[PDB]
Design goal:
Number of domains: 1
Organism: Aequorea victoria (Water jellyfish)
Radius of gyration: 17 Å
CATH superfamily: Green fluorescent protein
Function: Energy-transfer acceptor. Its role is to transduce the blue chemiluminescence of the protein aequorin into green fluorescent light by energy transfer. Fluoresces in vivo upon receiving energy from the Ca(2+)-activated photoprotein aequorin.
Structural class: mainly beta
Distance between the termini: 21 Å
Subunit structure: Monomer.
Strand order of the largest sheet: 1-2-3-11-10-7-8-9-4-5-6
Keywords: Chromophore, Luminescence, Photoprotein
InterPro entries: GFP, GFP-related, Green_fluorescent_prot
Oligomer: monomer
CATH topology: Green Fluorescent Protein
């Protein structure tokens, strides 16, 4: 029950708990790897629960560096901001999410993902290419703590592309107390030709907890993530 049928369409796709599939194929400095993830999203609470498995053995980069790569349609948009929810409005046909992630004093990830429904399942299919990493650096050397700092991300409309853009900084904690900066540049465009909601500037607030499955012998990450939109006030 929103007065905007365009909003009603997206809210209906995401009521209740929605199953999620993630499939990633990566290549970082010639180390090829794959990751499969499964879980559930509950967009009413901006809540995601996912378990990822490296299906090619040991992950050649640290799990925290892949959190942002590995479904913003599950973000909680407050009622007064639902007319700005691009991610759900592009569903079910979906959207393309592209990033370049610059690791300060190290290499970069380039990622391309298609996020869309396959039946009732929300699917995130990703290709990742990483180049120019130091083989003894914080990434290829696995020197980052297994956690994730909370942060806020500014979202802007990209009118020319009928989508959105976002640039933001992730600070990964290094095992010695320092931080490893990951500068994200992001763009999202609809897969379909139909209309989407293009947003006013706002931000997404995110918190993530990383854990392990004590019964799991494959290299894996359990992820609990909350994402909530904010920065537009209800006067």
């Amino acid at each position: 029950h929103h007065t905007d049928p365009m909003v009603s369409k997206g809210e209906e796709l995401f009521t209740g708990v929605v199953p999620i599939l993630v499939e990633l194929d990566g290549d970082v400095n010639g180390h090829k790897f794959s990751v499969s993830g499964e879980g559930e999203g509950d967009a009413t609470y901006g809540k995601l629960t996912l378990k990822f498995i490296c299906t090619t053995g040991k992950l050649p980069v640290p799990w925290p560096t892949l959190v942002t790569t590995l479904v913003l349609c599950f973000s909680r948009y407050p009622d007064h901001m639902k007319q700005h929810d691009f991610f759900k409005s592009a569903m079910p046909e979906g959207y393309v999410q592209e990033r370049t992630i610059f690791f300060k004093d190290d290499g970069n990830y380039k990622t391309r993902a298609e996020v869309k429904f396959e039946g009732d399942t929300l699917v995130n299919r990703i290709e990742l290419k990483g180049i120019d990493f130091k083989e003894d650096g914080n990434i290829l050397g696995h020197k980052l703590e297994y956690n994730y700092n909370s942060h806020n991300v500014y979202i802007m409309a990209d009118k020319q592309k009928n989508g959105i853009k976002s640039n933001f900084k992730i600070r990964h904690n290094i095992e010695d107390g320092s931080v490893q900066l990951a500068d994200h540049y992001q763009q999202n465009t609809p897969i379909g030709d139909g209309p989407v909601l293009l947003p006013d500037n706002h931000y997404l607030s995110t918190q993530s907890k990383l854990s392990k499955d004590p019964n799991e012998k494959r290299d894996h990450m359990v992820l609990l993530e909350f994402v909530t939109a904010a920065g537009i006030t209800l006067g």
